[PDB]
């Protein structure tokens, strides 16, 4: 078969790839819509007439094409959208869920965790999330050690002793702030400490890991296999969080997962974007191989953001929803979803 | 679909896996036939009733099952046979060549290299290989520096200045012998120096790489991703040579190829065994991504051994043959081959 | 003298080697019976007519023979059986206990430790072991941090404050689980933490050692001198646990013990298998040199599993038994034991 | 059995150990006679009544006894004499050559190399050695680069192009001298460069190895397993040369050989002393395992010094002699030799 | 001036060197008397007629003379005796205290620390030492963690909360024992932990330093500058304890002190032997440069052993005694002492 058209849509950029036999695949790119769309349009000059089944060859040709333009990250976010759409097309052509094409379904669902006067508001909100059935929540910090600790303390009190708690500083801290925060918050029972410092300073991450006891997580902006491998080599993280729509799509995240196993580093995919990104992430989560394999292994969990969730899921005919804290993974062909075109508006 | 039976055959052990819908896949295991067959028989207790499409899940479950038995290498060679058969089944089920399932066909053929009174015999034989059209040949050394040099010198003279020449010591040398050989043979124009020292001494490999200028190759017995990664980390090789039927099959060699790209280490698959192993290797070679991508990139080449070649290819209805030094890669469903069952004899 | 025959038996594979003068030696191989037997049968083609007294030469020739078959671990487990039988023959020929041939008897006995609604069952069982006289016990974990902690807590309560306690996760944990478990269990008084993570990830072991305070033990599946040395170099363990029937027999475990002394790493031999493996382990334990030598030094202790113990010891005429927690080490020629042939059934 | 007496003799100190059943063993210690004899006398206070068959236990007890006296090297040279005598006793008790007790005879003989107006004298002498049948010779340098080169050049001319040539500076050079010498002499065909710099500066050895291409050898004064391991870890040598009578006897040199295999470093035993030391070295050489095993492997060669050779061999009834460059290895019980007591004079 | 004679005496070997002008110097060697005396006698062959003022030239010539005898430690202990006597002669010739020749007197005295049913006996004895005025004491452990802890606890109770407490295991522990002991004893207030593990395993020392919080001390048997530098490079110790009579005398301990300053490692000289060794140590202590220089800096303290103290000091006319815990440092020419010859008996 052959690609006959590549289109870009908004409402976050979505990539639509149509084939001669009528098969349509959908993908999504991380980051600013316009830069991604321009690059996809550029990529499409070559994609037209190509065989969409050859995802590795397409990936490598397109990735290599944009090397001297300096914008590695943009190449990867743009390629991600194309790559996801292509796997969607493969799944539809072959009659298989992407999770099956990736090597099989370990799980039919994943547990979600909920993400959120800052002290009382977090405490209230997180208390409601627990009532809604979420086994875990993640709270945003990185503003100031003393205030952040007040928030963490109030959230632990509000959610009771059992619900899991993660914290995310979104690179808000200096190393010293992060180490001090981690030392003082550890007593509250924290499963991970996300992006404590700026993402370019991998040795600072390692410093935070060695200076306080909460497991450190990162990776949503560390590009593809090379960026991930640099962080793994520096000992930057206990948990790696690749973004499917940012790191190079299914083709590249498979390679990242391999690297993580060498280091015994857990993968927890970054989930954020429209229903398309979410659908792609869930296919990967279904297929993720436990490290180690055992009865009741450690399994991926899915970030769930009630903020703009209705909006972000409007692109889907059937929303991927958390039911008592659990999200079911589609098993139909490709991403197993149907696009609501009306919700979109075509760009260029 | 479901696996209904797993059978082992001889004539080198071959693995046959039959499914409920009648689909049959074929694979092959490196090493002693009987140990491999026993483990495959053991694996089959679980395989029966499983969905053959779920190759990653099957791989990881089976690999994990044999961990405390101490025999990691045997797990991998046995699993390899199963894994190859399963991909053959996937290809047949999906209507796709394995090379397409692996991500696309970069090439429809590969150049072969020919492998071989030891001085005159090598010189004559290699001179005939050149006349047969092979662009390259590999000669066996590791017996004694002075004698090996005489052989290398006579082969270069006999094949003219253009044909490429590789040498393989099959771990015959001490570090000092290997460094001395490499220093003195380099002037003859040698593309690589295969397995100069014992395969357990990765630092010795690195020593050979740093002490003489011919590129060092190895890997046919370094197990799966972990064994390969140890060699890559030690700086053991310029060229990695994974064996499909030994390292864990298509599932595991894909992961090995990823690792090699981090290090900018070339992959040249080990080719040796029956027509089944050869067919599997060729599917992988078709799909191998150049590192780097460029016009006329460096491409895999295929070891071709005229020794027992008719015998080893008797398992195929249509032999994979070198025509003026070039081997065409099948593009039919799965391995793209048909088994000559009459040539086999079932074991157990 | 000369080897006249090599036979394999079941009931776990046992190796019987007979000599021209009538001397018979017995050994045992770790892992699946059939693969081991096939390789022993293969080895026997050469062994027949060889001088059984030349154990190092035999070891190295046989080990080298199976290098390119990829199955290093299988070579070692098979060789182990042969090697143990050969030392048994040497001891009988020379009129000496293997422990004397290994360099002398430091000790005539060793203290055993006992190995075992999962919470109450462990607590009850371990409470009985203490009453039986065992100075120590080892409990199996690696299922889930919270549940495992409940088990550990109940076992410590049940056995009182004096009995030593070890834990074994059998590679059940991720690094993070293992570090968290170790941190929270340390307060219960734990002498070692066995195989916290998968055995291929040596750096993960080191991570567990640096992240929590219980001493880490491993080694039952790290092959021979090279595998052991990789783990020692990575800082993987505080305690190394080579399996005599798995690592290459007496010839190879002596070399492993040497390596451990360089690193000041304690050796505690893995004990598991039939009475033959147990007998071999005890000969090694008698001869193990303290590190350091002092009055009342740290001494090997022997794992004792009441599970299938009667069965596994049925191969012996006189069972090696724990009497108030202490096992006496035979001092007769060779392994100092007599085989109950009736309990066996010959294979091939 | 039991040791009844330990005696020290001169003519180089010799150690005689007599047992209750009349068995007598002989050993030798490296270095100044009197210090060695005093320590042996001290050791004998404990040795009397001990079982001579327990060589490892005896070794470790005696080695540990002298730790805080500061004189590690003296402990090892003294222990060496005792250890050699004990193995001689074991061999006699058991009816076995030491080479058999060490694990078997790989070889019944070894090739010797010959050791030697300094320019003409070396040239003449080495020319005679070649006529006598020696395959190789070693010349003494370390006096001055220009003069040493003149010597090397004249020796190569005199011995023809085939005879192997080694050089020994006996720590005479600075690093710079050694690198310059090695660079300029390499063209003469030199198999190794012995002790280029002072033995305490292991990093200087490594510097010499990296700065010039002749293989570096050392080790005659690097104590036992720990001293050897430090040199191996520093990358000090291509060839390790332990002295049996200096490094801790057969018990300790076995451990050193193990360490060398990890590093793929060749062992060539230092041979120097009376006929007793030579006899011990030859037993070890018979038993040395090739690294790697192959047809016609690299084998130990024996230093042969015609200087005081008649004198040093006067302690033997039958001299170990080079016949056309080859020395046959005794195969009788123990060291396989008989002592000429008349040649000795008892000390203390 | 010229050396006319060198004599060795007992009552521990003492070295007497007489000069043509009648000047006599005295020194002492660590370790077994007889080996030291033999080497001193050997050294004397050359010393006679040499200028005793040239201590560095003499040191280096004599040290170099014994290199290939393997006995580095013995060279240093023997040389130490000579070197101390030579500095004594220099001081007498020049009219200066050795402490002045070493570069000046920072202090006229040092505080001593006292060294010692094992629980009650230590507690009683240490309680008396406190009453005698010692600011500190050191207790001997390394027998068994539980018993050693009982001792430490009872000693802290008996001596009150202010007196300083050090512990010395004399290499009695495995790494694990030492780490466990240090963790559990730290709460008692321990200034240092001496020789926790065997002195050959420098990495084990480092392991003990990183695994528990009491400062680690060692060095009494690490030879001269090279042995000390290896320990410093390995991060073996917080406190280095060179023995003047063992490490190469004043000439070599000055060099060791220099090395320690690079690493910011404290020097506390080992004090043990006759009054001569004590006198030499005190001269060095007077001259030791603080690291850092400040008002009331950290100063050397002197081990004081009431065991055989009268005996060991019998060699002096005026004993160096602790008065309320403080020892005054002689300021007369040389070692500032007078020998009681009657207490000696000449050897050889
Ligand atoms: Ca709500
Ligand atoms: Ca985030
Ligand atoms: Ca901290
Ligand atoms: Ca032909
Ligand atoms: Ca090969
Ligand atoms: Ca070179
Ligand atoms: Ca019971
Ligand atoms: Ca275990
Ligand atoms: Ca921790
Ligand atoms: Ca002659
Ligand atoms: Ca030499
Ligand atoms: Ca150079
Ligand atoms: Ca008193
Ligand atoms: Ca001490
Ligand atoms: Ca600690
Ligand atoms: Cl659509
Ligand atoms: Cl970018
Ligand atoms: Cl599907
Ligand atoms: Cl990247
Ligand atoms: Cl969401
Ligand atoms: Cl078929
Ligand atoms: Cl296809
Ligand atoms: Cl692996
Ligand atoms: Cl072929
Ligand atoms: Cl029998
Ligand atoms: Cl294996
Ligand atoms: Cl015995
Ligand atoms: Cl190994
Ligand atoms: Cl048992
Ligand atoms: Cl005799
Ligand atoms: Cl024999
Ligand atoms: Cl040593
Ligand atoms: Cl000789
Ligand atoms: Cl005097
Ligand atoms: Cl010494
Ligand atoms: Cl003065
Ligand atoms: Cl030194
Ligand atoms: Cl004192």
UniProtKB/Swiss-Prot annotation, chains A, B, C, D, E:
Name of the protein: D-galactarolactone cycloisomerase
UniProt site positions, description: Increases basicity of active site His: 243
Cofactor(s) needed for function: Mg(2+)
Biological role: Catalyzes the ring opening of D-galactaro-1,4-lactone to yield 5-keto-4-deoxy-D-glucarate (KDG) via a beta-elimination reaction. This is a step in the oxidative degradation pathway of D-galacturonate, which allows A.tumefaciens to utilize D-galacturonate as a sole carbon source. To a lesser extent, can also use D-glucaro-1,4-lactone as substrate to produce KDG, but cannot use D-galactaro-1,5-lactone, D-glucaro-6,3-lactone and linear D-glucarate.
GO MF annotation terms: hydro-lyase activity; isomerase activity; magnesium ion binding
EC number: 5.5.1.27
Designated gene of the protein: gci
pH dependence: Optimum pH is 8.5.
Catalytic activity of the protein: D-glucaro-1,4-lactone = 5-dehydro-4-deoxy-D-glucarate + H(+); D-galactaro-1,4-lactone = 5-dehydro-4-deoxy-D-glucarate + H(+)
CDD domains linked to this entry: MR_like
UniProt organism field: Agrobacterium fabrum (strain C58 / ATCC 33970) (Agrobacterium tumefaciens (strain C58))
Assigned keywords, A-Z: Isomerase, Magnesium, Metal-binding
């Amino acid at each position: 078969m052959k690609i006959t058209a590549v289109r870009t849509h908004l409402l976050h950029v979505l990539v639509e790839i149509e084939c001669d036999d009528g098969t349509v695949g959908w993908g999504e790119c991380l980051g600013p819509a316009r830069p991604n769309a321009a690059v996809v349009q550029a990529y499409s000059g070559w994609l037209i007439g190509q065989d969409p089944r050859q995802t590795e060859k397409i990936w490598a040709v397109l990735y290599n094409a944009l090397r001297d333009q300096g914008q590695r990250g943009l190449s990867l976010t743009a390629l991600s959208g194309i790559d996801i759409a292509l796997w969607d097309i493969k799944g539809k052509h072959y009659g298989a869920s992407i999770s099956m094409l990736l090597g099989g379904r370990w799980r039919e669902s994943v547990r979600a965790y909920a993400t959120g006067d800052r002290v009382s508001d977090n405490a209230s909100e997180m208390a409601e999330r627990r009532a809604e059935g979420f086994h875990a929540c993640k709270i945003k910090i990185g503003f100031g050690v003393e205030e952040d600790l007040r928030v963490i303390a109030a959230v632990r009190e509000a959610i009771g002793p059992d619900m899991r708690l993660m914290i995310d500083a979104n690179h808000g801290y200096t190393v010293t702030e992060a180490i001090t925060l981690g030392d003082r918050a550890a007593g509250f029972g924290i499963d991970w400490f996300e992006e404590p410092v700026v993402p370019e300073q991998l040795d600072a991450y390692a410093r935070v890991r060695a200076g306080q006891p909460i497991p450190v997580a990162g990776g949503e902006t560390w590009h593809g296999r090379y960026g991930m491998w640099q962080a793994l080599s520096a000992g930057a993280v206990d948990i790696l969080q690749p973004d499917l729509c940012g790191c190079g799509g299914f083709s590249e995240i498979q390679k990242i997962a391999t690297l993580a196993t060498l280091h015994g580093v857990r993968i927890v995919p970054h989930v954020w974007g429209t229903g398309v990104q979410i659908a792609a992430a869930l296919q990967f989560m279904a297929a993720m191989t436990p490290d180690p394999v055992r009865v009741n292994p450690i399994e991926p969990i899915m970030e769930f953001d009630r903020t703009h969730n209705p909006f972000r899921q409007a692109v889907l005919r059937e929303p991927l929803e958390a039911v008592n804290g659990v999200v079911t993974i589609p098993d139909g062909p490709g991403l197993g979803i149907e696009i609501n075109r009306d919700a979109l508006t075509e760009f260029r």
